[PDB]
């Protein structure tokens, strides 16, 4: 009958966040030794994005898996290590993220 449309299964991005006083406006969840956010994945996922915050205006979304921040790779990283990587972030934060659809 009819055909399925072209679909983007997964995606990798870079979103330059410009932290205005008050933080990035997001919450992270997961880490090596923590309860996975998706399946058994121990990555650093974005658990919230305060709308009209810095990270929202930049394109970040809930569930985006945080891979790298300003040249620092979060591969196998614990939670607090991803917390401290983002606390010395500076006024400009370039993250590499990963996503799924729906």
């Amino acid at each position: 009958l009819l055909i399925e449309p072209a679909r983007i299964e997964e995606e990798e991005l870079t979103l330059t966040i410009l932290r205005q006083t008050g933080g990035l406006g997001i919450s992270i969840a997961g880490g090596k030794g923590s309860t996975p956010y998706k399946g058994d994945d121990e990555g650093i996922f974005i658990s919230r994005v305060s709308e009209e915050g810095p990270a929202a205006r930049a394109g970040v979304r809930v569930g985006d898996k945080l891979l790298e921040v300003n040249g620092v790779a979060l591969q196998g990283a614990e939670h607090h290590e991803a917390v401290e990587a983002l606390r010395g972030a500076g006024t400009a934060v370039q993250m590499r993220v990963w996503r799924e659809r729906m």
Partner: peptide
């Protein structure tokens, strides 16, 4: 058990 969450 271990459920972590941190505002930023």
């Amino acid at each position: 058990p271990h459920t972590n969450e941190t505002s930023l």
